[PDB]
Design a protein around this ligand. Structure first.
Ligand SMILES: NC(=O)c1ccc[n+]([C@@H]2O[C@H](COP(=O)([O-])OP(=O)(O)OC[C@H]3O[C@@H](n4cnc5c(N)ncnc54)[C@H](OP(=O)(O)O)[C@@H]3O)[C@@H](O)[C@H]2O)c1
Length: 482
């Protein structure tokens, strides 16, 4: 019985856009190791040229600790197997046929059965031109190219659940179509891609590289994201891309996976894998060492975190379920985007309160030895309800300015940043969201208990008390070794 995940990647070939990608890469590992009769992964990669991109493929994928298990099942074969299976494709989603040289571009659009598109710019306050170009006009470029594909069986788009924007309360898995805004001061009522496309980059002094003008564009992006009802320039474009992919898939059958807040693999290759210092981490990181006695955060409120581990297995379940093209399925009408919320905030929510606890409890028992290898002073995270009671903590500038008391106002451009730091995380620390986990639950209920073994994405089995203190922040601290 079940849903067939293993069997499926039978001999199938992928185009995939996450090159140094945190998430995409874990996916690649998983596929090779799950079934080494995949048809090949093509792996688009940014690069000066294509031997300069074999380098990227080696230094950041094959010669990484993530792949160790594989490097073990293959003997002296692996390095062969890796070459037989990972085709570097020098490429850029910012330009047409995602920047692939043509002779190859076509070789690809002939062989490939599944396109996974995790590529993205994930800077929050990113300038408009950039975010729009990668996050919202790129997905065009791919989908566009996707249409010239010969036997493309499924197109899998990776966008956030933070895509759901300013939606408060429980939020169901439903798609965005090309007109939609999330507005239910400043407000607009319909979303003119055209109009956005033109403010973001029309002329743009293609040659003006004033970090002034570069600000004007960072600022502008936020203005709009917040006009139409998204928090920031990323979640905006990330949604607009969903809108593009909705408008442009035709006969093709996409899945839309919405993972919220990826974190360290919860057990599959091995628990404890991470890349990158993006959002939660750089605070967990800061508070490991100096400068965060307290953060600005409703401590009854939730952070929707998922293990990277479980994102990937949801990803692979949908692939096996929805891109098993058929005939009476292709001869029958176009279906809808398959949206999957792969998320915790409706089932096993982790509260900023238990979070601040586990930060303390993990930095106490085995803290961060500093520059002189002399271990840290870390108490319990102090969480504030207000920019009042958070800014009431410049009681540190002076207080933390105790290193000077031996014998017998002070300047604080240091609080001005720990304040900004928290100003900026505000919208996420006070997120009204809660991400209904529903379709994605029914996907499990479809699997054989045999499959629930290999490909766990029961968000429910997470013991937050454990996975944060013991699995994530370790595996985090380890990666940011460099
Ligand atoms: N952080 C999270 O937990 C989180 C949040 C929710 C959902 N997601 C979404 O899932 C995806 C996973 O990304 P990630 O965070 O795992 O890794 P990441 O490092 O944030 O993703 C960046 C990836 O996109 C590639 N990329 C950037 N610009 C490109 C371009 N012009 N052309 C082609 N590729 C380009 C990068 O290439 P380079 O190799 O040069 O970087 C890299 O492979 C994203 O869409 C993200 O928004 C993840």
């Amino acid at each position: 019985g079940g849903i067939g995940i293993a069997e499926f990647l039978g001999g199938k070939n992928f185009l995939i856009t996450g090159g140094t990608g945190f998430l995409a890469k874990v996916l690649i590992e998983k596929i090779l190791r799950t079934n080494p009769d995949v048809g090949k992964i093509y792996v688009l990669i940014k690069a000066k040229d294509g031997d300069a991109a074999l380098k990227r493929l080696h230094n950041e994928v094959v010669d990484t600790e993530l792949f160790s298990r594989l490097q073990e099942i293959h003997g002296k074969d692996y390095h062969s197997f890796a070459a037989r299976k990972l085709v570097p494709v020098v490429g850029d989603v910012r330009e047409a046929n995602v920047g692939i040289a043509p002779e190859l571009a076509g070789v690809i659009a002939d062989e490939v059965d599944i396109i996974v598109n995790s590529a993205a710019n994930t800077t929050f306050d990113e300038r408009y031109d950039v975010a729009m170009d990668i996050n919202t006009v790129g997905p065009f470029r791919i989908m566009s190219f996707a249409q010239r594909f010969r036997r493309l069986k499924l197109f899998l788009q990776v966008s956030t659940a933070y895509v759901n924007g300013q939606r408060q309360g429980v939020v169901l898995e439903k798609p965005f179509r090309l007109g939609d805004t999330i507005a239910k001061q400043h407000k607009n009522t319909m979303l003119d891609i055209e109009a956005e496309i033109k403010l973001a980059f029309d002329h743009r002094r293609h040659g003006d590289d004033s970090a002034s003008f570069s600000e004007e564009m960072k600022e502008l992006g936020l203005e709009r994201a917040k006009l139409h009802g998204w928090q920031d320039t990323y979640v905006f474009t990330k949604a607009m891309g969903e809108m593009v992919i909705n408008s442009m898939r035709g006969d093709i059958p996409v899945v839309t996976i919405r993972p919220s807040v990826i974190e360290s693999t919860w057990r599959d290759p091995f628990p404890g894998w991470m890349e990158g210092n993006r959002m939660m981490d750089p605070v967990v990181l800061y508070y490991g060492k100096g400068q965060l006695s307290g953060f600005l955060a409703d401590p009854e409120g939730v952070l929707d975190v998922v293990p990277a581990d479980m994102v990937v297995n949801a990803t692979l379940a949908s692939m096996a379920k929805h891109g098993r093209g058929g005939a009476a399925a292709a001869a029958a009408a176009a279906e809808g985007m398959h949206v999957y919320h792969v998320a915790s905030s409706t089932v096993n929510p982790l509260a900023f309160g238990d979070l601040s606890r586990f930060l303390f409890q993990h930095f106490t028992g085995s803290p961060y030895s500093d520059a002189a290898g002399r271990p840290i002073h870390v108490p319990p995270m102090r969480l504030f309800d207000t920019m009042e009671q958070f800014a009431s903590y410049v009681e540190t500038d002076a207080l933390l300015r105790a290193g000077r008391l031996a014998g017998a106002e002070l300047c604080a451009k240091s609080v001005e940043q720990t304040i900004y730091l928290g100003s900026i995380y505000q919208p996420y620390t006070f997120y009204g969201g809660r991400f209904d986990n529903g379709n994605t639950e029914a996907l499990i209920g479809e699997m054989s208990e045999e499959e629930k073994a290999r490909f766990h994405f029961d968000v429910r089995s997470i013991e937050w008390t454990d996975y944060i203190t013991n699995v994530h922040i370790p595996g985090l601290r380890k990666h940011v070794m460099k």
